[PDB]
């Protein structure tokens, strides 16, 4: 109960919530990879890819990016399930696996954006304006929030000769 309603974990939970919602929105927003051939700037996305100058249409073409993205979102769902179950019936310990899942979702998103950076580098020079900063911010938010939630969930480092972990609260 003590590390459940404290503000130090409430703020990290809020950060995780905004990060997860913006990450879920950022999987469809393909506004990060633009390439100028040299009036034919392109748009590269996980699912559908298109180039625009009327005649505009986006469709697929490296599906490992999609697979790791769905794995990351499944991790986010499991973390949210654990976090929700932690609050009710005083499950104070369930906040740790939620942190682990959030951290791993952030890492999976980081690897997905890394593979997409490799893809856009292998295609002129690109430019990140809207969605790459969004994905990097989502990764940073999820990673730091998961790490902080894990650190707050773990009780404390003893700092006393008699004090030890797994004490009676």
């Amino acid at each position: 109960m003590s590390p459940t309603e404290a503000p130090k974990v409430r703020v990290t939970l809020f950060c995780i919530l905004v990060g997860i919602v913006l990450a879920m929105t950022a999987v469809v927003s393909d506004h990060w990879a633009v390439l100028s051939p040299h009036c034919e700037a392109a748009h590269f996305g996980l699912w559908r890819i298109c180039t625009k100058r009327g005649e505009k249409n986006c469709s697929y073409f490296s599906i490992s990016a999609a697979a790791i993205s769905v794995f990351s979102l499944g991790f986010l769902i499991m973390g949210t399930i654990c976090a929700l179950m932690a609050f009710r019936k005083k499950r104070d310990y369930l906040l740790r696996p939620a942190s682990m899942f959030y951290v791993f979702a952030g890492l999976c998103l980081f690897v997905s954006l890394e593979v997409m950076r490799q893809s856009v580098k292998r295609m002129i020079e690109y430019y990140y304006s809207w969605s790459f900063a969004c994905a990097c911010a989502a990764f940073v938010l999820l990673f730091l929030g998961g790490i902080s939630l894990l650190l707050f969930s773990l009780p404390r480092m003893p700092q006393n000769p008699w004090e030890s972990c797994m004490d009676a609260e």
Partner: peptide
């Protein structure tokens, strides 16, 4: 999944002997 069709995840199995200290 790479074989079916990313480098730092191989470091997690190295940390397996950090838990060796528990004893």
């Amino acid at each position: 999944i790479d074989t079916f069709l990313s480098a730092f995840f191989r470091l997690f199995r190295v940390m397996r002997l950090i838990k060796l200290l528990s004893r």
